[PDB]
Design a protein around this nucleic acid. Structure first.
Ligand SMILES: [Zn+2]
Lengths: 121, 148, 191, 104, 52, 156
RNA sequence: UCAUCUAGACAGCCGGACGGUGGCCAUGGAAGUCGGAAUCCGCUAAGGAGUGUGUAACAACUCACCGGCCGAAUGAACUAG
């Protein structure tokens, strides 16, 4: 049961990595569920946002390491609270939308991985 | 400048809210009655926008209210205060129309989902001639296009 | 269930030096030195790399492996007490009669005297254990600070000063008068 | 809100540990000097049961006397009066169930 | 009146305790069993009765 | 410490006899000093003296007056101790004190006021307008014992 | 005997704990939390038509759920020496 839900997560992640060349790693701190929900709706058409336990994710990437070897570079960046954005749009347009939306007294993009290349941005 | 939202059974406290805005209770009630002239029989959310002189009344769309209205209902005095249990026909088109009416207001996840949520909202209504409300929603893909 | 090997670690900072013959621990740091007899607890110590010391017990019962973590906490308290020090702040609490606290000297022994606690004519004197320094703090009304290296000596002196001001033959939920410890910390806290 | 102002006033005088008869004399003197908060009050004060009594206009010149607990809000006192109303109705229904068999 | 914070600090030691129902011992507020031997370390505890 | 707000008195806005803006009530029930003013007093010990004066027993009041007088005598410490608030509170308490049935209480009180004036002369102008009628009333009194020393002291 | 567990468990800190929807009756009110029934979807990593505090009703706070630090066993009920 727990394992079954977990197995599904592993599979979807693999599919997402294959589906979108552009990957954005986003760090969320003090972001409300409502704040997150709005961002998801704005980016529903061009982006996929994935949230998961890091321990779960690292194992998955290692499991899928033989295929898509360049994704290994993303693993050092995975540490800390993180989210994964998979998008057709290459870079800035997605980034601009994420930072701007729902800033209240705050989503940040920690790193960008595109086509096997990592950008601090 | 100031917006106040209240759930009001139509045809009609209000005064306490009105005093802060310095608006006559009777005037507000009359305006609300006219707005709910469409949603009077049953409780509906009413939005009052105050211009600092007068308040404008509109009826905000609510899933329960729209669903209750869709179920055909004989007008009820409510003096009886009966259970007034609501029984309804499938009304698949009306629910789809309701989903469209919501138009993914407040960001419903999908057009089909908005309809599914609308179906769930019919906890009160039977919502089908022979089925639990939204029991077959997962089963049938029909009407997904209609909601959009 | 006779755990055959359980083992804890203590970290030694750069400033201190710890000397352990049989079960006598001497910790020497910047603020001074402290010692401790531990011949009642029956553990074994082992220096690893001059900033780590493991303490272990072999074939121990449940009470014995409880005592292992206890002695680790004691020697670690000694290390952090000789590095950062220990400071207890206590506050005076009264309704009508103000508590008047001074420091007197019968035969040069640094007594703390307490006057007018609930208006009595009795004078409460608590002695001061050695190594504990007491300052009546400014800029906060009715606050006393006890500082030192030994958490045992500082907290015991603070507890003696708290217990000397107990109310008798009254409802103590209404007669809340006394001297109560409000803060426990280090002399160089947030170092 | 004005009942809450009167309650805050009487509770502020209570929290000074002031004598109850001196508080009543202070209410009488301020009624003579025309303070509205004092003039809303009725003088036989039930401070032993933490209860005051207040005059409210029936029409927005006749005034009614209503007892207010100092330890509950004005709305909470109103809910208590509503509760005493609701308990009275159930006894009346029990009487209506009684009437036929009793008179037979 | 003492002060609100100072009443809180004094009531931390005087009023925010628990009482063993068997031997009347004054106990920590989050305790589960009495620390005394004579009641047999029982778990019959009650909060200490406050004023007001 | 002292607690509560005199709302009814505050709405009244009456300084009564007092000309310094402080409510003065000869009558026992009203004109009592504000709790806030008492909280404002410079010394906790002073506060106690005021509390004692507030207390009903004549002996306790008398004892309190004595303590205050001795403190006034030590002006060097007491100049810091004296506060405008203290003076305002003093005026309010003094009004009740002059009315005292006991001769001793009145006499001590009158003497205390005179001592205060001498120590604080030229710094009590706002207070003077209030103090003078009260002091004068005491100095000219039917009873020789209260009046004669008070009068001599007044001249002094 | 049930459960959780290196795909990260139980304590401890820190963050989120959301929309349809103030779901349907009933009340002068009761919007998760006076009660009667039902108790379903969306977004989800995750969030009950609600665990309590909580207000006249709100608002607000906290929960059981998911997440960073921790890295390995732990929780409940019961039995008998
Ligand atoms: Zn016990």
């Amino acid at each position: 049961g727990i394992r079954e839900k977990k197995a599904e997560y592993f599979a979807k992640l693999r599919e997402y990595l294959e589906e979108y060349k552009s990957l954005f790693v986003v760090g969320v701190d003090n972001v409300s569920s409502q704040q997150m929900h709005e961002v998801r709706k704005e980016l529903r058409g061009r982006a996929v946002v994935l949230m998961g336990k890091n321990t779960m994710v690292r194992r998955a990437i290692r499991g899928f390491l033989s295929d898509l070897p360049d994704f290994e570079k993303l693993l050092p960046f995975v540490k800390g609270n993180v989210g994964f954005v998979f998008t057709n749009e290459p870079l800035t347009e997605i980034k601009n939308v994420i930072v701007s939306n729902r800033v209240a007294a705050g989503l940040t993009v920690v790193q960008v991985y595109d086509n096997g290349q990592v950008f601090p941005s | 400048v100031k917006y106040l939202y209240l759930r009001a059974v139509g045809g009609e406290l209000a005064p306490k809210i009105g005093p802060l805005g310095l608006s006559p209770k009777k005037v507000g009630e009359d305006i609300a009655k006219a707005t709910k002239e469409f949603k009077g029989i049953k409780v509906t959310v009413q939005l009052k926008i105050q211009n600092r002189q007068a308040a404008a009344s509109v009826v905000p769309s609510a899933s329960s209210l729209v669903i209750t209205a869709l179920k055909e209902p004989p007008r009820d005095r409510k003096k009886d205060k009966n259970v007034k249990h609501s029984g309804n026909i499938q009304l698949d088109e009306i629910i789809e129309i309701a989903r469209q009416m919501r138009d993914k207001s407040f960001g419903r996840t999908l057009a089909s989902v908005t309809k599914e949520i609308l179906g769930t909202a019919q906890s009160v209504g039977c919502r089908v001639d022979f089925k639990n409300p939204h029991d077959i929603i997962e089963g049938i893909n029909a009407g997904e296009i209609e909601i959009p | 269930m006779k755990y055959i090997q359980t083992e804890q670690q203590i970290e030694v900072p750069e400033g201190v030096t710890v000397s352990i013959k049989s079960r006598i621990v001497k910790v020497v740091g910047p603020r001074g030195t402290l010692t401790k007899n531990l011949k009642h607890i029956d553990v074994t110590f082992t220096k690893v790399n001059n900033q780590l010391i493991k303490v272990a017990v072999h074939n121990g019962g449940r009470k014995h492996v409880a005592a292992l973590r206890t002695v680790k906490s004691l020697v670690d308290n000694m290390i952090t007490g000789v590095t950062k020090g220990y400071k207890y702040k206590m506050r005076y609490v009264y309704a009508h009669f103000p508590i008047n606290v001074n420091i007197v000297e019968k035969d040069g022994a640094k007594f703390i005297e307490v006057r007018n606690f609930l208006g009595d004519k009795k004078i409460r004197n608590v002695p001061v254990r050695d190594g504990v320094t007491i300052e009546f703090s400014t800029n906060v009304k009715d606050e006393i600070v006890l500082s030192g290296n030994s958490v045992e000596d500082v907290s015991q002196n603070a507890a003696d000063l708290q217990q000397i001001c107990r109310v008798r033959n009254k409802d103590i939920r209404k007669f809340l008068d006394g001297i109560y410890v409000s803060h426990k910390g280090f002399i160089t806290e947030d170092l | 809100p004005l009942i809450e102002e009167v309650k805050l006033a009487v509770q502020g005088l209570i929290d000074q540990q002031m004598d109850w008869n001196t508080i009543e004399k202070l209410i009488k003197s301020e009624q003579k000097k025309g303070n509205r908060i004092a003039q809303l009050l009725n003088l036989p004060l039930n401070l032993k049961q933490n209860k005051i009594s207040v005059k409210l206009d029936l029409s927005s010149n006749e005034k009614i006397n209503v007892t207010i607990d100092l330890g509950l809000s004005a709305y909470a006192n109103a809910t208590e009066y509503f509760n005493i109303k609701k308990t009275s109705a159930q006894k009346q229904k029990k009487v209506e169930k009684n009437v036929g068999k009793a008179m037979k | 009146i003492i002060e609100p914070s100072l009443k809180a600090l004094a009531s931390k030691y005087n009023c925010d305790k628990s009482v063993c129902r068997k031997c009347y011992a004054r106990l920590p507020p989050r305790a589960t069993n009495c620390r005394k031997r004579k009641c047999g370390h029982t778990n019959q505890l009650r909060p200490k009765k406050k004023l007001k | 410490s002292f607690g509560g707000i005199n709302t009814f008195q505050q709405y009244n806005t009456d300084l009564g006899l007092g000309h310094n803006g402080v409510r003065i009530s000869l009558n026992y029930f009203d004109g009592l000093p504000d709790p806030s003013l008492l909280n404002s007093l410079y010394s906790n010990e002073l506060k106690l003296i005021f509390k004692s004066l507030l207390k009903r027993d004549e002996t306790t009041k008398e004892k309190a007056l004595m303590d205050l007088s001795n403190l006034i005598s030590d002006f060097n410490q007491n100049e810091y101790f004296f506060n405008d608030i203290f003076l305002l509170c003093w005026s309010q308490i003094y009004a009740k004190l002059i009315i005292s049935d006991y001769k001793v209480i009145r006499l001590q009180s009158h003497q205390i006021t005179i001592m205060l004036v001498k120590s604080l002369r030229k710094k009590i102008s706002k207070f003077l307008k209030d103090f003078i009628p009260l002091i004068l009333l005491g100095t000219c009194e039917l009873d020789y014992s209260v009046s004669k020393p008070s009068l001599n002291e007044l001249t002094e």
